[PDB]
Structure 1
Amino acid sequence: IVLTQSPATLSVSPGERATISCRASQRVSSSTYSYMHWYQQKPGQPPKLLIKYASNLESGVPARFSGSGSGTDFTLTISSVEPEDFATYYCQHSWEIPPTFGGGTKLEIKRTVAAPSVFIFPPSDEQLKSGTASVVCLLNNFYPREAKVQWKVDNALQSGNSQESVTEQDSKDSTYSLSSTLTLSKADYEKHKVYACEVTHQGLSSPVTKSFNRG
């Protein structure tokens, strides 16, 4: 049995209703029960059972979750989406062996625009003893995801020695954070004075620069 979930991604504003669907390639209902179950997987965590047998909420699961359907077509509804609902949702049948899973639906939350708060960290003395200097620029709690970070050393635009990582949406406030790390040799680090991170984001009317002066 093949389970087809739709949509692949669902973007909703906070508090709006979310409905995702799962279609089985054949009927998974008896007279008394339907053998479809729904799981929620939040980032970094194992899947968690939310709804068993199409519509029975698992213990502890909040009341805004419900499920419905019979035969081939099943739906999971969140009546009012909260930040904690950010997750991938998977359906699974138990009609027969083998059980199979749907492909998942990723639920995204379109919260209000928020500019990043920007912070910069020089290399630790502990790291400098090792011969390398990492400089870290943090863009915290912003929305939406699109952001540009550029590194300047003594006012010169850097290319080719930084790496970025972005978090998934935060489970409490739906924002992103981003880190940009500039990696230099200690010798090169010690040859320059001003280290700056320049941040562009749509929540800001001009780029924001955070900097420090070595020594």
Structure 2
Amino acid sequence: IVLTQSPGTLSLSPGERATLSCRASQSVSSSYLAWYQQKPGQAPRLLIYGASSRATGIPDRFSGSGSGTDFTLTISRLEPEDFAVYYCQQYEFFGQGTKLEIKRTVAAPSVFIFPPSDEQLKSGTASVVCLLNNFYPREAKVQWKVDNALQSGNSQESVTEQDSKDSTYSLSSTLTLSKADYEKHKVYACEVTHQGLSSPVTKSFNR
């Protein structure tokens, strides 16, 4: 019901060769496999039909090939416009999608912390924001500590799309508390871990 695509994420530098895989379902014929590109905020875009035929207007660096159940989409020379999500399709079945990201050197995050605004405190809620800026790869861990006690279940995080200039990611982690809980404690801290960091980074402040 959902076709399998590999890898989940493919990281390459512009100008390299990309190969994406899709395993069709054996119950249904595979002669009608198609590939699609989807960029943020846009509808998908037909790239390859019939497993190996380019759609009109598609540059020749895109090519398709396939056996009976194993199909591959190849991009010969990655242009910066080619980094996006790619889906395979077989009748009513879509693939899980493969994200093609730009691969850069490892960059550790710059960590900043923001207390709640007095405005928000007047309303009865307190949001503490921990910012991880311009890092790569995408994997990171943020741990919150209030008066040196590990928190859990009171934080949500968001991550940007890959930056078009420097190819880095940025991550936000927001700790939400009531005014009462926020005023019962003294020190608020976020501890960041990342493969570029030799030791954890902690940013904190005193209410």
TM-score between both structures, scaled by the size of structure 2: 0.69
Cα distance in 2 for partners of 1:28, 1:159 equals 46
Corresponding residue pairs, total: 203
Question: Residue deviations 1:1-42, cap 9 Å, x none?
Answer: 9977555654445542012355778999999xxx66431123
Larger radius of gyration: 1
* Structure 1: segments with no counterpart, 5+ residues: 93-100
Please say if residues 30 and 69 of structure 2, whose CA atoms lie closer than 8 Å, have aligned partners that are also in contact. no
Cα distance in 1 for partners of 2:123, 2:202 equals 28
Cα distance in 2 for partners of 1:71, 1:187 equals 63
Question: Cα gap change, 1:30/1:47 in structure 2, threshold over 3 Å: closer, same or farther?
Answer: closer
Cα distance in 2 for partners of 1:84, 1:37 equals 20
Cα distance in 2 for partners of 1:7, 1:153 equals 39
Please say if residues 85 and 171 of structure 1, whose CA atoms lie closer than 8 Å, have aligned partners that are also in contact. no
User: What is the aligned-residue RMSD (CA, Å)?
Assistant: 4.2
Question: Cα gap change, 1:152/1:28 in structure 2, threshold over 3 Å: closer, same or farther?
Answer: closer
Identity of aligned residues (%): 90
Question: Cα gap change, 1:185/1:54 in structure 2, threshold over 3 Å: closer, same or farther?
Answer: same
Residue 123 of structure 1: SS of its match in structure 2?
A: coil
* Structure 2: segments with no counterpart, 5+ residues: none
Shift of 1:144: 1.9
Please say if residues 28 and 72 of structure 1, whose CA atoms lie closer than 8 Å, have aligned partners that are also in contact. no
Question: Cα gap change, 1:104/1:185 in structure 2, threshold over 3 Å: closer, same or farther?
Answer: closer
Name which of structure 1's ranges 153-162 and 20-29 shifts more when overlaid on structure 2: 20-29
Please say if residues 8 and 104 of structure 1, whose CA atoms lie closer than 8 Å, have aligned partners that are also in contact. yes
Question: Cα gap change, 1:188/1:77 in structure 2, threshold over 3 Å: closer, same or farther?
Answer: same
Residue 54 of structure 2 corresponds to residue 57 of structure 1: yes
Cα distance in 1 for partners of 2:172, 2:142 equals 9
Please say if residues 43 and 168 of structure 1, whose CA atoms lie closer than 8 Å, have aligned partners that are also in contact. no
TM-score between both structures, scaled by the size of structure 1: 0.67
Question: Residue deviations 1:98-134, cap 9 Å, x none?
Answer: xxx4554443444321111222222233322221101
